[PDB]
Amino acid sequence: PSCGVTANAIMKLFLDKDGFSYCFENEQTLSLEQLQERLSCMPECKSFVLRVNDGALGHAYIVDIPKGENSCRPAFLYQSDLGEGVTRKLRFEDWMTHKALTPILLDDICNYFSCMSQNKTDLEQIATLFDIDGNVKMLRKENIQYQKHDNFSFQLFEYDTDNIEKNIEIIKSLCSGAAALE
Amino acid sequence: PSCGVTANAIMKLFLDKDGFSYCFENEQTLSLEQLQERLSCMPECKSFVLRVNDGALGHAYIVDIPKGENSCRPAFLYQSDLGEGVTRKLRFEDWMTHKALTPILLDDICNYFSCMSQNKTDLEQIATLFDIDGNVKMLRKENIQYQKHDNFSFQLFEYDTDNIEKNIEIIKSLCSGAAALEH
Structure with a gap:
């Protein structure tokens, strides 16, 4: 499956429930500026999932923001890659059994x-x-x-x-x- | 999962694509009379999935109708069951790795x-x-x-x-x- 397909399926795992089914093409989108505003007001006591449509890199991926402290707020990055853009081919299984397990800083991917x-x-x-x-x-x-x-x-x-x-x-x-x- | 949760997930497997996400609660429903009419004119050159909410049996399940002729048309039945009702407990894994891979006759499940x-x-x-x-x-x-x-x-x-x-x-x-x- 493509990176976008993997991303969409992960969104469904986080969000689908009785009476609501996530559908990428139908959901509301944010710009970077709008995102920056939402992240600046995020409470410590809520968890969020961020779907990234990265048109430069050529690639979609998921940033998971668990409940946590706003100073050095951690996040986790989930992705697969067909290897047609900047980054190399990457199987989801391989990403998720190795590098995905280590938290990153949300600030670092936001700086990116x-x-x-x-x-x-x-x-x-x-x-x-x-x-x-x-x-x-x-x-x-x-x-x-x-x-x-x-x-x-x-x-x-x-x-x-x-x-x-x-x-x-x-x-x-x-x-x-x-x-x-x- | 319950029989209904399994059924809904199977519908998503068959149907979800770019621009369409199946959502059980919001989909259109057919009566038996309606379904009997649809089956009478069902195209042979298309494949269909049927989600069944069987109130009398107290059970939900999927009937997969591949492309095929309407004379003795084959189908497959997919299900799980928690075993609280008429039928006994059945794990999806067990059903699918044993009885489910043999086709049945669409006419036989319809007669049921x-x-x-x-x-x-x-x-x-x-x-x-x-x-x-x-x-x-x-x-x-x-x-x-x-x-x-x-x-x-x-x-x-x-x-x-x-x-x-x-x-x-x-x-x-x-x-x-x-x-x-x-986490």
Whole structure:
């Protein structure tokens, strides 16, 4: 599956419940400026999931912001990659059994959004966040797609830890049977 | 999960795509009479998934109708069951790795709908369709909840085989990384 497909499916795991089904194309989007305003007012006692549509990098991914303190607020990054953009091909299983397990600082990925929105990023910043080995040599600057405005689009939702737990239980219960299905 | 949660998740696997997300509570529903009309004119060149809310049996489940001719048209039945009612406890994994991979006749499950809607319980019929072993002794006829009308509610959708394939790949991928999604 593509990075966008993986991202959409993760959103559904966090958000789907009786009476609401997440559908990427139908949900409300935020600009970077609007996002920055929401993140500045985020309470410590709520958890959020952020879907990132990264048009420069060529890639969609998820930032999970658990409940936490606003000083050095942690986050987790979830992604897969077909390897057609700046970053290399990356299987979800591989990302999620290695680098995804270590928290990052929300400020660091937000600094990336700010820099890349102005074409002011650098490969070391990109590799540190997105490459499984932090290896700058695996990036292809020649595959960047910068456009003066609107490089990024975002979707930001509050989530409940009970709901992602339940949805993961559901998909686990289907996995073996589904594979058999044709 | 409950039978209904399993059913709804299976509908999402068949149907979800860019610009469409299945949501059980908001979908259109068919009566049995409506479904019987639709089946009479169902295109042979298309595949369909049918979500069944079976009030009398007290159970929900999926009937997969692939492309095929309307004479003895094949179908597949997918289900789980917590075992509180007529039929016994059944894990989706167990059903799907045993009885589910053998096709059934669409006409046989349709005959069942017709019989149950008229309160003509046939325990052998129910075991043959729904029990992993086909064992009538495992059923509890006492737990049938026949009502005078509106026993059944259905949802019927066309599906594309490319989409179910893509969604199964996604679910297997997600399961492989699931430990990292919770903190």
